[PDB]
Amino acid sequence: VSKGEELFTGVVPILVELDGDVNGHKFSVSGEGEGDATYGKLTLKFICTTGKLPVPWPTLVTTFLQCFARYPDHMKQHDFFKSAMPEGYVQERTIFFKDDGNYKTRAEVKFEGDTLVNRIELKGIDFKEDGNILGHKLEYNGSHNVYIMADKQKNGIKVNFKIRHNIEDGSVQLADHYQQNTPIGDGPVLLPDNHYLSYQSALSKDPNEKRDHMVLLEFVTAAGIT
């Protein structure tokens, strides 16, 4: 097993730091938790440290650690994420909210000692002040697939997927995701055959937490290659 892989055989502490600006509404979020890739398990708690989060927490779920996905033994040569560790990779995304604005994110995911860290910058523009996002019309508790393909030319991967956030009136707010990952190091990485990650997610609250926050539990499993 490679250095990349063996770095995830046990429980790994996680730290996330995000700075955002959506239509001029600036905010910061700190996250802590742990990942157990053996079980594709993520347990996290995010806290808005600047007061009230100006966007719905559900819209930040996908932004808030694919290196913790459980890759079946027979699919191990297709795990790009762990292969780039500990040096890490840069994840870039554009998330288009149908009939509203878009988020553009840049995240540097890598190890700092024994801690897996993700430093994120989020920029949102063209949002409607009273739309489903800035107007907070999305339900908090709104199995889904994330499609991965190799991008040989850029020595990384290209990822695409759609999320449908539940609107309070019963409708749905589509969030179309376009993602790219590129290694930070100059070392070797695994370029995968087409496959996907299956997500199970659940949002909750900490009963003793007064700050605006989100408790997020996820189970991520690679599939698509039999």
Author numbering: 1 to 64, 68 to 145, 150 to 233
Which lines from the publication concern this structure?
Fluorescent proteins share a common structure composed of an eleven-stranded β-barrel containing a chromophore that is spontaneously formed through cyclization of a tri-peptide sequence following the central α-helix. We here used yellow fluorescent protein (YFP), which is a GFP variant that has a chromophore composed of the GFP chromophore and the phenol group of Tyr203. Insertion of a few glycine residues between Asn144 and Tyr145 enhanced the pressure dependency of the fluorescent intensity of YFP. To summarize, though further investigation of the mechanism underlying the amino acid insertions remain to be investigated, we found that glycine insertions causes the new static water interaction to the chromophore, which can enhance the sensitivity of fluorescent protein to the hydrostatic pressure.
The YFP mutants were named YFP-nG, where n is the number of the inserted amino acids (1, G; 3, GGG; 6, GGSGGT; 9, GGSGGTGGS; and 12, GGSGGTGGSGGT). To confirm that the glycine insertion produced a space near the chromophore, we determined the crystal structures of YFP-1G and YFP-3G at 1.3 Å and 1.5 Å resolution, respectively. In the YFP-3G structure (green), the four amino acid residues of β–strand 7 (146-149, GGYN) were not modeled due to poor electron density in this region, suggesting that these residues exhibit conformational flexibility. Because the four residues of YFP-3G were disordered, the cavity of YFP-3G would be partially exposed to the outside, which may change the arrangement of the water molecules. In addition, the main chromophore of YFP-3G is largely shifted. The most remarkable difference is that the side chain of Tyr145 (Tyr146 for YFP-G1 and Tyr148 for YFP-G3) moved away from the neighborhood of the chromophore, producing a large space near the chromophore. On the contrary, the absorbance spectrum of YFP-3G did not show the peak at 380 nm with low chloride ion concentration, but the peak appeared when the chloride ion concentration was increased. This chloride ion dependency is similar to that of E2GFP, suggesting that YFP-3G switches its chromophore structure to the open-conformation by binding of the chloride ion. The fluorescence intensity of YFP-3G was 6-fold lower than that of YFP, but it was still enough to be visually detected. The pressure sensitivity of YFP-3G was improved 5-fold at 300 MPa and over 13-fold at 100 MPa, compared with that of YFP. Fluorescent intensities of YFP-3G expressed in E. coli cells increased with the hydrostatic pressure while those of YFP slightly decreased.
